[PDB]
């Protein structure tokens, strides 16, 4: 079986400003097979109300998914995306960097 590891980007839908409603995105792509686990995290804790796109794939057959939750950024709260897949020995964590 071909096994392709997910690429991960974590970012906001709109320019990130404190006190102003936004959406936190975790985009997973380039992976196979399609079974994958994805959590958005607030200060290390799993966010409960997380939705995701319908499964689709690229020309090379690798899958992609967008996971997203409503959020209001503040100065102190830290955000991340946690991913597990068959290709990963330990879950991979990517921190959201607003300064990018």
């Amino acid at each position: 079986m071909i096994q392709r590891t997910p690429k991960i980007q974590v970012y906001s839908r709109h320019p990130a400003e404190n006190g102003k409603s936004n959406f936190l995105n975790c985009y997973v792509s380039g992976f196979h097979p399609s079974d994958i686990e994805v959590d958005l995290l607030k200060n290390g804790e799993r966010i409960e109300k997380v939705e995701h796109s319908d499964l689709s794939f690229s020309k090379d057959w690798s899958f992609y998914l967008l996971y997203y939750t409503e959020f209001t950024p503040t100065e102190k709260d830290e955000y991340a995306c946690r991913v597990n897949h068959v290709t990963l020995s330990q879950p991979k964590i990517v921190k959201w960097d607003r300064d990018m």
Binding site: M1, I2, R4, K7, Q9, Y11, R13, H14, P15, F23, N25, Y27, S29, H32, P33, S34, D35, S53, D54, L55, S56, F57, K59, W61, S62, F63, L66, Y68, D99, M100
Partner: protein
Amino acid sequence: GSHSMRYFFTSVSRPGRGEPRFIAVGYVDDTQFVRFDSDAASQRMEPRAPWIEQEGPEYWDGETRKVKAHSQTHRVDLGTLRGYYNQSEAGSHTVQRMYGCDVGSDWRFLRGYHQYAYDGKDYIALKEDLRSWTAADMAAQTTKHKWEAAHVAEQLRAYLEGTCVEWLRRYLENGKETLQRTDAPKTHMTHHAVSDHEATLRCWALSFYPAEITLTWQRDGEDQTQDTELVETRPAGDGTFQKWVAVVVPSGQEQRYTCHVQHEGLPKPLTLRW
């Protein structure tokens, strides 16, 4: 500019009990407009864009029936392919199908496609002439013989040149306010210092539609690829797209570097400096 309609289908077998998970999505250009998920309560093709809701109950009945037929073919396929490849019942396997049509600026047929994969690998695809098949291996060659006897290419060609083109034209008209609109990237640049000698410049493109775009760096008016990072184009989640490209530069020399943006929503290429 050119336009496309494309359908994507994934089925994943569930060995212990029951039928496979089946997910179908439909697109016009970079806009998803329909979906079917076998794990969903409704068991109907669902709208995912306002302009498709214009279509009446017959449309939805018809699409639902067809997408359920697609799902059953895929279920049969998983069993046959398991046989062709001498695999057990213990493992989960995957079939993937993509098909659709491209039209140019005049909205006339340009090309059609229909390709199929098993566990992430090329199985069989229709060729560009829509008359013949590309089979990757001897299992796929068996299918090719079967599809040749039954004149499958002929039926697909008719859809791809006819209905496919005709219904894309129809969709582009009904959704013209969004589908026929281009959204130009909103651009800016950011600065970071790694140390007192090395700096990072990041060129941003946001809120653009369609997804196709080119971002490149120049140094003193020459193209610069070394010491750059270019991320994959990513969905914002409101239907628009985002991308950035970064370059590492000696601190103090920022002014030599320019970012260049090409997009169909820009009549002229855009240039940015720090």
